[PDB]
Curated annotation (Swiss-Prot), chain F:
Belongs to the orthohepadnavirus core antigen family. Homodimerizes, then multimerizes. Interacts with cytosol exposed regions of viral L glycoprotein present in the reticulum-to-Golgi compartment. Interacts with human FLNB. Phosphorylated form interacts with host importin alpha; this interaction depends on the exposure of the NLS, which itself depends upon genome maturation and/or phosphorylation of the capsid protein. Interacts with host NUP153. One of its GO terms (biological process) is symbiont entry into host cell. The keyword Disulfide bond does not apply. This is Capsid protein. Phosphorylated by host SRPK1, SRPK2, and maybe protein kinase C or GAPDH. Phosphorylation is critical for pregenomic RNA packaging. Protein kinase C phosphorylation is stimulated by HBx protein and may play a role in transport of the viral genome to the nucleus at the late step during the viral replication cycle. It is found in: Virion; Host cytoplasm. It comes from Hepatitis B virus genotype D subtype ayw (isolate France/Tiollais/1979) (HBV-D). The chain holds residues 1 to 143 of 183 of the full protein. The gene is C.
Length: 146, 151, 151, 151, 151, 143
């Protein structure tokens, strides 16, 4: 229907592709983070924020893809076709979920405006020649300076 | 995280299980209705309601499974296993998307409290043994069945 | 140019797509209805509403297809091609004019908001499997359901 | 009773699992730090904070497992089974005590809100693939790295 | 006609001449940066600033050189001439667009006075023999030198 | 990025497509007109209008292609490949520059709204079947 998941939150698909694909954490690390930090708000009857709503849908949509990958294991006899579907789900489909899980978990932790400015800053830093930029890769931190 | 998708919105998976699985329209009919009614609010930069947010996610996850079903048709050589995956996506995985599409499209229309009272009333009707069950099932409508507007 | 004829009027092609083919009266009944009701405003120099403007244009297009269908009868020697073109105009192309004439005649009769909300509620009914819906479709009529005219 | 030890204090076992298991200092280093800093408040008759209460219990349970490890060395004749128990206590059981010692010693220092923001920030850093990961991990400190006090 | 592209903007060809060739990102990185940041203002009907106007024109010139480089691949049979023209466009002509795209993207990001004063101070550094200057060039960045994003 | 060059100025590539490709004056005639009329403002250290900004970029971007066409003459033997590249630059690439120079020189001379109305009027003239098409095509005039 030509829907961009990020633009009600002030970002775009293009702005999350401005960070390298290998930057984003694994789906497992991101689901561990949502569960440790956000679990009781994600399981609550309250809406909380639109990031909570959006993140609840992505956690359930990913769990359905893992039921699919478990199903392709049992119900597909062909080994090469079974391995080729499971790889597509974990690699090609996993990339869009770990951008989406990363974005909402980061906007809950660090704030939405902080994460949108971080995408711009980190993607410009990665494209600068190393002699002309700050030596350390940017990172998000909730821990204050001393 | 267990995460019932409906309890944010005042329902549960068990309340939507009052409806039989064959109650729900096809994903295509529901996508047509979301587009006919809610398309411009679904494409907008604004959060409109949480139903809009929840419905955007479902429409995008479904389009992502159709990319999968198109991919499996191209990239799987074995026809037997190609058809098992394409049928599991369109049938098994489609059932939970057209329950979820039905729920949010019905709450954007009709209101959310109306859809929960509809689920309770439809359950009373479907639990009735067929001998005592009235011919008119409850249905979501903003109109009577016979609408006389005159002018 | 990707123009929707109904979008100007608050409706959509797929909002009207749920009405069945047997829902509509024949083109001839629709033309008789527009003429028995709206004829003097349709033939007037004034713009009356956009429904009048849109309905004048559709009546004139249908008369050009009837000149075509009469021309095809005279100018084609082949019986199989002559009947296959005349059948396509009266049936396939007739269905788009039946739908389009019904819409503007009804928005003049009942009001435009009444016709759009009727199409929302008719679609809920037609998208329901026959087991789960009341056996009578919703009705758009000037008349009471009893159809007894006092006063 | 499931009883997460950390949720009284605003964390969980899953939040402390952002840290790898080899992140944590040895039990000996942590016992030295509790003694260097908190010893007199840990030996006092007063409840100081709940971190003090929780940390006294962990220090006593650990000393009770070291009585076990000393006992097994004396009273088990079989060397093979003696070494399995002493290694399971010092390694497997030691891991959860040095996570718990790290947590309360770090919250007595630095504050508790700082340790939870540190866990969130260290998780962002450790989840980053090593290509994009900055060289300086987040660290708990009350000072800058270069502290110029002059006089 | 002896036009300086930078003179309008408060700079000069020789003010930007001191930046080394390795200073600039590739054209592709510059085009990705302009698109990830400025795209909706670059594609808008409005004049936003003169940097937008100047940057729109340079993006369109570079696309014409990429049509040239693709045309040269197809339409030249000689390998030595085909590679010698494509190398001249991507390297020699690319360096003027790298310099020109860097300048307007930086004046949108950092402000124009910040970029001009950075070029004054970068030139002092680059005109110094390496023995007499600090080993790190001055940096124009949104980020702290530590690159740790709080808030 | 699509980036229609004419969109910030109130036109489109489709609107400038009303004019045939052979309508436009040569690059040399257009650069002579810019130099006679506009040269001191084009060399000014001032934003004058956005048409000045856009026209400075096109004059410089065309001067780079003339360095390329000179470079191909010096640095390429195999005259068949030298002649295909120099003619592609002067003919094929030149068309887009003499549309772009024509547009900004005209909006700068006659006004931008006048040049948009001229495109609409020229399209009416060029769409007219030749029996009813006036012998005088529309032309831009300040006189």
């Amino acid at each position: 229907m030509d829907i961009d998941p990020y633009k009600e939150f002030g970002a775009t698909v293009e702005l999350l592709s401005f960070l390298p694909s290998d930057f984003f954490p694994s789906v497992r690390d991101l689901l561990d983070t949502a569960s440790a930090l956000y679990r009781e708000a994600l399981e609550s009857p309250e809406h909380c924020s639109p990031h909570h709503t959006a993140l609840r849908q992505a956690i359930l949509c990913w769990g359905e893809l893992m039921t699919l990958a478990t199903w392709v294991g049992v119900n597909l006899e062909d080994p090469a076709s079974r391995d080729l579907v499971v790889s597509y789900v974990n690699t090609n489909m996993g990339l869009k979920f770990r951008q989406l899980l990363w974005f909402h978990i980061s906007c809950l932790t660090f704030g939405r405006e902080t994460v949108i400015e971080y995408l711009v800053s980190f993607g410009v830093w990665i494209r600068t020649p190393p002699a002309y930029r700050p030596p350390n890769a940017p990172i998000l931190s909730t821990l204050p300076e001393t």
